[PDB]
Amino acid sequence: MFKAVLFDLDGVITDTAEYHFRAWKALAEEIGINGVDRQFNEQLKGVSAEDSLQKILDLADKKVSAEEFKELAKRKNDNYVKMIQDVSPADVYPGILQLLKDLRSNKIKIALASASKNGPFLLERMNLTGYFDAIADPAEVAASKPAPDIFIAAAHAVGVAPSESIGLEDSQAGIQAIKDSGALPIGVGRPEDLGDDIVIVPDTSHYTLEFLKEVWLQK
Numbered sequence: 001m002f003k004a005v006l007f008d009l010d011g012v013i014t015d016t017a018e019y020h021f022r023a024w025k026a027l028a029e030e031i032g033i034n035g036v037d038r039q040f041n042e043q044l045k046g047v048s049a050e051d052s053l054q055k056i057l058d059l060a061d062k063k064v065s066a067e068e069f070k071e072l073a074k075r076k077n078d079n080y081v082k083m084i085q086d087v088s089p090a091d092v093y094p095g096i097l098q099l100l101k102d103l104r105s106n107k108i109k110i111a112l113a114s115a116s117k118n119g120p121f122l123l124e125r126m127n128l129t130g131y132f133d134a135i136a137d138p139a140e141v142a143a144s145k146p147a148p149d150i151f152i153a154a155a156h157a158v159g160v161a162p163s164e165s166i167g168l169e170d171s172q173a174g175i176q177a178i179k180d181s182g183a184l185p186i187g188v189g190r191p192e193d194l195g196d197d198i199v200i201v202p203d204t205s206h207y208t209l210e211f212l213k214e215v216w217l218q219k
Ligand SMILES: O=P(O)(O)OC[C@H]1O[C@@H](O)[C@H](O)[C@@H](O)[C@@H]1O
Pocket: 009, 010, 017, 020, 021, 044, 045, 046, 047, 048, 049, 052, 077, 114, 115, 116, 117, 118, 119, 171
């Protein structure tokens, strides 16, 4: 039996992947880059703020000064942080609160493996902080998604091996990070985006302890 679940936040616990997308798209268009559509945004999910901006600049073969890079990243963050102020417990995705309760009842550790610096604030907005045994700080890892470091850190922070853990993710980069950590990935989203080679559920209501159990036994 698995001993921990390692949660991504954005697009898994709540619909904040939508807000990252909207904020990055707005930023890109301000600097004359029009290619950040939903399809391109699949390459941005799960990756750090710096890597997101660089991927956007690369899309247009654009070069900015170091000073401008810092300002642009700050501008997007300030916008994103204003978007999320009204997030509340009502915004928790279906099934997620119940899963957290069921994991705790069964003495399964719960850790956050979000690349987002805004992760702790969002857990507070959603009254979820008390369910988490650990939050892996994305600033403390040497390498960000799709490197496995944040999932390894999350598992270690709750005293469990990655190989005894399940990771929940909505992103290509994050699934790869889970795979390379040794944990078992279960994605949420469209097969057209996350791959046909792992277990994928179409929506978070499918993330039941029953199903994680159904899944684990068969790995
Ligand atoms: O800019 P932040 O809040 O640190 O977020 C970093 C990344 O956090 C991840 O959780 C999101 O999937 C990415 O879209 C985002 O870029």
